[PDB]
Amino acid sequence: MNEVGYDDIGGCRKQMAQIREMVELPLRHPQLFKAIGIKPPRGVLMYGPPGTGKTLMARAVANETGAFFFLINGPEVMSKMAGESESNLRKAFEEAEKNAPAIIFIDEIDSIAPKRDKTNGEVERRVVSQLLTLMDGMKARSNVVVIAATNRPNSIDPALRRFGRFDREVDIGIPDATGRLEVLRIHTKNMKLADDVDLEALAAETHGYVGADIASLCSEAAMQQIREKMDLIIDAEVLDSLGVTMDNFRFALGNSNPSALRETVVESVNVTWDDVGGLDEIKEELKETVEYPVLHPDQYTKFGLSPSKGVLFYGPPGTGKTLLAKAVATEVSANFISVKGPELLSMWYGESESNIRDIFDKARAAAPTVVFLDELDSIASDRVVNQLLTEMDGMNAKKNVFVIGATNRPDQIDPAILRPGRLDQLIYVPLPDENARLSILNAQLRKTPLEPGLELTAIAKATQGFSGADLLYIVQRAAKYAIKDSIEAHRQDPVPYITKEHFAEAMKTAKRSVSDAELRRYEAYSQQMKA
Amino acid sequence: MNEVGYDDIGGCRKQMAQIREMVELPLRHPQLFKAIGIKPPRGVLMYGPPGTGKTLMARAVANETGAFFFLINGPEVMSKMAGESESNLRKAFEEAEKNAPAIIFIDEIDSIAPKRDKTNGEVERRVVSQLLTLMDGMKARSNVVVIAATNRPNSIDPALRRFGRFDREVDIGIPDATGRLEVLRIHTKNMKLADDVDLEALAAETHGYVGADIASLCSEAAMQQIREKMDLIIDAEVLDSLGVTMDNFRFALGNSNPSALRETVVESVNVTWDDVGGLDEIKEELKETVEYPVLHPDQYTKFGLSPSKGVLFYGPPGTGKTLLAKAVATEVSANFISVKGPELLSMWYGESESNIRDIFDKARAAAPTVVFLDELDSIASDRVVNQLLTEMDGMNAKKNVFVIGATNRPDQIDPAILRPGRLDQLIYVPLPDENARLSILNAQLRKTPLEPGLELTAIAKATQGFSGADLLYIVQRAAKYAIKDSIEAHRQDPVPYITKEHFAEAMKTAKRSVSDAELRRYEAYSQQMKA
Amino acid sequence: GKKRKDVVRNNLR
């Protein structure tokens, strides 16, 4: 069992098709490339978080295309004297050249060709130079395609990304819910799965689960089932009766440690406009700013305009700014990236694995995309401020890259941000509305049963000028009271719904998050700026 | 002296059962795995403090299974390197394959695969690769299993934890009183012990002693006994009279020291609510907060209400912020862990043998667990605060891991720690009242050989303004006076008890360690929080 | 069939 086709992968239709074309056209039909009269592309750099299926995908494409497949590791060939490694590399390239068509899979290229700033040993520079010379020396007629894999795309010598080298980059992010379901189906094609299963529920619950983690979860569930069935002990009645159960999957979920979320990565979004509580004027203003240009580029080009790539939000905390940003990213079918506090503060201190350049380059590669920076004032240090300023000034013409920032203290942040060519667009978050609060409560209570047609108007009219977080805190307090009452009744679900007493108790205990003086100051500042 | 069966292992019944179930089934009963259609796991990694019997447990399980055992030390492989490194591993794997069943047992696997960072070697990289490739290459039918052993679980490349490598982790901690008694009984099988043996008391008093330390203690006791008997010293009459006594064990304890308690380790607890009196409402609230999801997770998940595992205690020092946590851990039957303020300061300076990341990894691997952060405000530290926040955010609420922080100055504790989804729950711990103080005195005095005639009200009334520590100090000073009187009477056991005079003197000579101004400030802050 | 291959179903995968 060492052969796998495209059917053995899931959740990467876009990347799978990209690799398929970019590595089959130069091999299967090189004639058309010369018919147009161009040099077919050679380098292909696929990168992603560890355990996302890079090696498996490369092996699958190589085996399915039926092409000569010379495989080179990373540290294996790197740990040796300069003569030996060069010998190894030259032999690999010569063998690939001699027996065309050939594909070379230089795995873990990062170790071979790291960045010169921190690792400047002459061995690394010599190896990189020979690799570049060999890469440029490949004959156009020869059908050789080089594929490299790495986990930190910005942690390699930039020279390898120039034309005539690993130019075409591919990013393999976390699989989505559909991707997770596909992976689960692929892995669970041999287990004696029981009739009762919730694969869709498992996909919904599993967030930030790379393929490796999903396989580990399936194996753990099978082991748990075996352990449960080991008590009865071989009888064929035991063998046939063996079968995994949804409870096993839940236990495995409870006993696993996903690691994709550790570092900043690209994630999809699905939020929608209706998820917000209203404020249609701000929605339309933001649409004019960000989305309409993408849908009306011809009008802007005719009259003459460029998209204003950047908007800064300010106002009371916990007002749904993140929900608005996710909705905006969803409406353009673009991947979303976020950085929150420590994610950038660690780079500010330097102890981290990803730099601001890394995230910006990932956003560019996965364009179109929206990058959101929370508590942007948390850094207002000088180095990170300068780097952000330079990156923002380095905005592309029509790449649709957008940056959004969250901060309730615009004055403290460096005024350098609010200048032409930067986040000159300022948006204030107003107070929530009664209808907005009622809609938020209903949305948060989609699954929790309550009184049919429960009277929330009294609470809505009692909660005037309260922040969004107050509604959620009140809901949680009422839910805790209801659970306590149900537990007391059972020990001493006859009342699945909840009456007004829980909400009244929460209101008595509940207090506003935004202070009256602070709210007044924010409103006065907003009005002064508007004037 | 090989072929040591399970009899030579005690205090780690759970770990032994796990290893047996995970090793015998792949080898003795693999038909089940093919019946359910999965590749049986191979990757087993057991780690624990030095001298905890890891090698002995591996030897015992291997011998009991009767499978060909092989050992690959760390120093031996690191003492040769060159071309022997890969050849030795390849021949070991071939030998195991051709004599299946077999077990490969590595030692100090960190030395052959240290965790990767700026300080990363180059030689390891190939051996690791070779090892990884061979393990993956082993056929399913081949009854082979690989076991590692490292003192620090988070001191190796997290690559060996990926699916298809060492993923099934096992943690071994300091044995409990039962474990220590079992170890002593196992070792104590040949000494011509005198009838004066109090092994139960030895196990109870010996806290933080690993099996190696216990063996050393037995050796030193035997040395002391022969030292005592040297005078008559060979004639068989002296040899027959040889025999250790409880005094010898006391001497060994006085001349022997532990080697494991200092570092952050996982240990069992047996505290119960009965130990601490008063604050019944706080007890019920904390029970509903923590136990109820554990006791009834199904209802908790049905009625939403995501648990908030960050619970903080604030108030005057010596109010009993550790017994509450120990009781909480005991209720869930979890392995309680504590990290003190000096540990945090050492991490801040960077000259610390461990990191908070390692502590949290240990907590997860030993789940369910209750972690206690003592003197949290002592850091006041931005770097360590950010690291702790990131680690907490990296903890999924589904996992049965709870964290409790202790701080006497909530004012100087960092708002970033108080956000929802974090250490947000706050509780105030005031001084015990008359009933609480009298209960504390009664329970603590149980160990003391007091004299009947204690005055409940007389002792309790004057003790206003005294925390647990002040009462403990008064008791200790009274006992010191009693000891002084007893020794004076002996020199110039008529008094195995303490008269009321000692306690009267101590309480008339007592002081209020807690001032009124700080108590007033604490109550004012509590009222402000309540408002 | 597939896998550049050309009882039969198993052989052709």
Ligand SMILES: Nc1ncnc2c1ncn2[C@@H]1O[C@H](COP(=O)(O)OP(=O)(O)OP(=O)(O)O)[C@@H](O)[C@H]1O
């Ligand atoms: N669709 C999938 N996506 C990702 N992983 C998958 C998928 N299907 C199966 N897997 C499993 O996930 C892992 C993917 O392969 P692998 O572990 O080599 O990934 P990798 O991190 O890219 O590899 P390496 O860094 O060693 O090149 C394997 O365990 C594979 O069995």
Ligand SMILES: Nc1ncnc2c1ncn2[C@@H]1O[C@H](COP(=O)(O)OP(=O)(O)O)[C@@H](O)[C@H]1O
């Ligand atoms: N329609 C809405 N109106 C107001 N508040 C909302 C709405 N929808 C969600 N919220 C609240 O706003 C939160 C998102 O904002 P948040 O990320 O807390 O802001 P900040 O980054 O300033 O802390 C949600 O988690 C919820 O509590």
Ligand SMILES: Nc1ncnc2c1ncn2[C@@H]1O[C@H](COP(=O)(O)OP(=O)(O)O)[C@@H](O)[C@H]1O
């Ligand atoms: N149950 C036990 N747990 C721990 N050590 C034990 C146990 N039983 C015996 N020992 C003895 O304790 C010592 C532990 O050393 P060893 O077994 O080499 O482990 P390590 O490799 O951690 O040093 C040995 O003398 C061993 O025989």
Ligand SMILES: Nc1ncnc2c1ncn2[C@@H]1O[C@H](COP(=O)(O)OP(=O)(O)O)[C@@H](O)[C@H]1O
């Ligand atoms: N309910 C209680 N409240 C306060 N002190 C108590 C209580 N029950 C027992 N004590 C005594 O008070 C001591 C407090 O010690 P410790 O828990 O270390 O205090 P702290 O955590 O406040 O530093 C206990 O060891 C015990 O002797």
